[PDB]
């Protein structure tokens, strides 16, 4: 619970609260009654919606892409991520090393494209979502051998019902996630900047099973991360910056805050 | 009777004395030690060299200007050609270790300015040129402070960093990197400052070429300010002292 | 966010003494500001943030 | 200021007189310009409320 | 095996639970955990510091 | 990821387009370069260019590394 | 249980339960057997859906608003308040300040609009709804990046399912609601009179996933709210007047009631 | 965890009920809240007022 | 471990912190307090606003030069038209009420003088014209400071107040001033001055618009000097919060 | 909310627009007189306009002041 106000009166003593050096890297821990006088308050208010957990775990969106029943686009492939969105990445990166499982949710939707075909009488779609691990073999057609899933995880999903919902705990090879690493995969200090081996989740493909009509229909699959179980370790300040890149940290310089018209001000300018 | 003001920090073989100090800052609360049992993953007996690499290492000094920005060193590349630190680190595929970090400079009661010192874990840097990532030999100086700048750096298809002293490099409010451990060195009240840092990491170990694990940075936030006839030359040094450090995967030196 | 109904307050600061110093000693100084909570600080409704924003998919 | 460390010193000097103004800004902990920028006002602007006592450290 | 909790209620009642899959990646969020201790980032100095005491002596 | 995708070379002219392959990548290796030279299962300096240099000898050249589901790609200005 | 009658018999006495004085503010306590004679009546009546509770807690229709999708309305907002409808807007006005939980629900219907595009099949519709509470950013448009729903709440929904529904708890910064505000919120007395912040509780917005067809389709939402877990205090007279606005309580003077032919008169003229 | 309580029935028998979420405003409305005390808005009066009694003396 | 000169004083909403502090000089040994049931004789019961009333109000700034003979402000009037206690002391016919007082002048080590801060008990004046009586206006200023003169001031048929500085005003030695309540403040080793005094009238409460209880007097018996390139401008401020007040004789606001 | 939606100003004429902002509205602010000027990120007479002045100095004229989601009118009878 959060703590609660004791009653203060007048003071003339030695004791000086309100007197500290702040180069000793220490946050002063004065309450209002150091420096006036107060009534006692019993407080009922909690911290509760301000945990990791809470503040961590709610779906979003992440990615999303299209393929079509016919013509050159067949089937979507993605590099499972977090960094793509802005959201989502921004609340993660308020730490360094993170620890979760996922709860992974697909919205899947379909449209009519124009044609000219006539008597189009269109049957139920059918989607299968195929998650292949790093390292493994990868479709190069819709039609490909690999769609057999005999050890892969797929998840096949008739338009009309529930959106498919599954749970992926913690993958990583090291002990926690990291969302920053300042160095290099070559001991020669060589090759690209901040790229590791650590958060590599695999890839996310998906096609129609059948294709349904005689004229074209095009397909789109939104991905949405919901972190589970949450550890977080090492404080980090936010981005003041608007993202450029999904494998990097580049940014433009921009201003510590916004500007008023003068010191004394109480608007903004 | 005595001081607070007055500490003394003995490591190896050597000793420091400040008669002017604010206190230690303690990293989250940790002091070092050395890796448990039930912890480890690497299978052989590791070595300790104790004295012998746990002592302290003084850099070259950097001058403290009326204009001056900043300066930044990343931990591991500052030591690693320096003494036994520098050769077990060459001779070894896994390190571990915290730090002791003193930061010194002196002046007179009128020489005014406040200067942040920060240990920012993973301090991961951006290059000017978006496509492009920063090159390491812009990245680290090891025998060398690096330089923050003051203007914004121009992108024309070059490897450099966007080392803007209110971004940190780091794209981020520069005066939210409180959240670090950190001290402020303030002319008139300060001398020196101290931090002692622990192993910080996702993985028990790490190659120590590779990965910074820590970068030490020193900012101005108020300028240096002295009127006429005043010392114009000022110094600052830093000292760094490796604590409970422990090396794995003895084979030829070097790194490729 | 903005608002009149749940208005906070003003903050100053004003001169009780000038400043002094000696000869050879700067007369412009300045003054820095840190803001943290107290222990009875707390939340609620959590939202987005309107400081980040995007037009398209980072790469 | 905003594009420099300026932005973060507050001048003060020697005057002939007293009782002059240094500074002024509303208690507006998320949505004051001054505030909304700090690791506080960071975290506040996740959320639709808030409540407590602010501590202002002055050095 | 099923467990009775308390539900979020205000200031100034019990819910059930069981689990039917076998991994325990696939149970609920823990959104009751709240534990604090704010003194890592907040006054780790390494000599304590009392606060009617004046810092430095 | 290519190093170094941006880049101006002003002078044989040596045009570099190191690259790395993710874990993911499994898909057949294929090397297009862009003003004049493919590679499929000018002249490339390195015999082993599967091992991660597709670096050419000689406006923009484009070199394009593409092994599913990664997708790479080096502007090189040449004056 | 409701209060049952008790026998009396004749009388001739002082005792005088049927004089009073209304001036004092009391309501007279007589029962019939204070002024006649009475059998023993035991009365087996309950009074259960008077209860506040019974009265308010029936789910009912606040706004209902659409959209398309092709062409300038894509999506539609609405700030939450149950002032813009008479029903509901009457029966919670019966007091001063009330304190509940609300549970939502939403029917939303889509029609056919004539035009003269041909060969036209169309896929199932899936609808997002996204709450955003007050201060957060708010889509200007359909493919908005605000539609990431990180941190805003958001729901889902493919025609031909059940209707969604949630809970949503009590959020007044103050102790209760408020149905009536004598004041203003400016400390000059200027500005709106009788608009407060009290009772905020954000916007909705509503919008197509996917357009379906290559033709025109035009939904409706239909909003609808249940007070549950009510707290109310003050009650007041009952609104004589056709309600104006839905910001203020503005009226056209009415007469007390409905007129007869004469004070005698047994029938309504 | 389960509570059963009674039904609305006639004059002149039992449900079971489970909670299934955290938050306690998730649950069902309380319809059973028979309480009343109408001596507030009636009979306010500083001092009290028997009925056979006249109000005034 | 704490140092003496540091004091903190916290009264209603506010709260003075020096650094540099003799110590507290209280009265006559007397803690203010509020008036007793056997030393009373008004029977209404009073009414006591405490945190509202009994609180700092600081005043205007005056500056010390080189040739600055002294100022003096008489206590119920410095506050007459100041928030709350002006208020109360409008509207009421009788006030009873303690002080404390606090002096504050800082300067750097270089600069000299010392200043005696006392607070004097009926500190009744005398008119430079021997018929007549010092006039209101002349004797009492309610938000500005009074100051002394060093020549003697002209007799020709007015209603001045001889304001000479040896004579204190009173026509007695100003080195004896002494025996009253007081403290020194002198610049080399003070920074500030504060006095807690006790309500003192030979009557228990009294009406606060036709008479002034106590009277604080301010004087330089050391110059002020300094070198030049020295700060030039010196200010004195006054700040005054009263204790344990309270009121009888609630009417319509005025005093005639 | 602009306050005094409906007026008639008899007489330069000063037309007021004086409006205030809900918490919900984080939309552009967008102001629009009707009858001639328009404001997007006759003389307005404030250069803050932005904090709630969108008064203008000079039939019926229209005042539409909107931030998304609120929208308001004002409508003035200048004679």
Known sequence: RVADTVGTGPTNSEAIPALTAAETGHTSQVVPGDTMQTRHVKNYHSRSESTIENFLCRSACVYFTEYENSGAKRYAEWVLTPRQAAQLRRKLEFFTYVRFDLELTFVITSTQQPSTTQNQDAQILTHQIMYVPPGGPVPDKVDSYVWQTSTNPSVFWTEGNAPPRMSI??????????????????????????????????????????????????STIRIYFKPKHVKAWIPRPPRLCQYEKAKNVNFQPSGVTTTRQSITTMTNT | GYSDRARSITLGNSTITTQECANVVVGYGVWPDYLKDSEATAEDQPTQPDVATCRFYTLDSVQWQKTSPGWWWKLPDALSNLGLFGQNMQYHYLGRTGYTVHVQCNASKFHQGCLLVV???????????????????????????????????????????????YNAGMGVGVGNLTIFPHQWINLRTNNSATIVMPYTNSVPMDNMFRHNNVTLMVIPFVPLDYCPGSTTYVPITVTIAPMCAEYNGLRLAGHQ | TSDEYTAGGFITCWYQTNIVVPADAQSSCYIMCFVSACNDFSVRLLKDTPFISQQNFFQ | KVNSMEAYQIPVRSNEGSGTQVFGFPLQPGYSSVFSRTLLGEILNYYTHWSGSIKLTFM | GAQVSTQKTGAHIHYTNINYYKDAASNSANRQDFTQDPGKFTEPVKDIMIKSLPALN | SITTPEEMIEKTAYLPCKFTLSPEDQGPL?????????????????NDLKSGDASINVGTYQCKVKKAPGVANKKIHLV
């Open chain 1, 169 to 218: 705990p913690f993958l990583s090879i090291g002990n926690a996630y990291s969302n920053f690493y300042d160095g290099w995969s070559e001991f020669s200090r060589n090759g690209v900047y901040g790229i590791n081996t650590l958060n590599n989740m695999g890839t996310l493909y998906a096609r129609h099973v059948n294709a349904g009509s005689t004229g074209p229909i095009k």
């Open chain 2, 119 to 165: 240990c920012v874990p993973e301090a991961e840097m951006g290059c000017a040129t978006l496509d492009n990532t920063p090159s390491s030999a812009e990245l680290l100086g090891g025998d060398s402070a690096k330089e923050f700048a003051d203007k914004p750096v121009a992108s024309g298809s070059n490897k450099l960093v966007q080392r803007v002293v």
């Open chain 6, 30 to 46: 294929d090397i297009e370069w862009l003003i004049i030279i493919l590679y499929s299962g000018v002249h490339f300096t390195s």
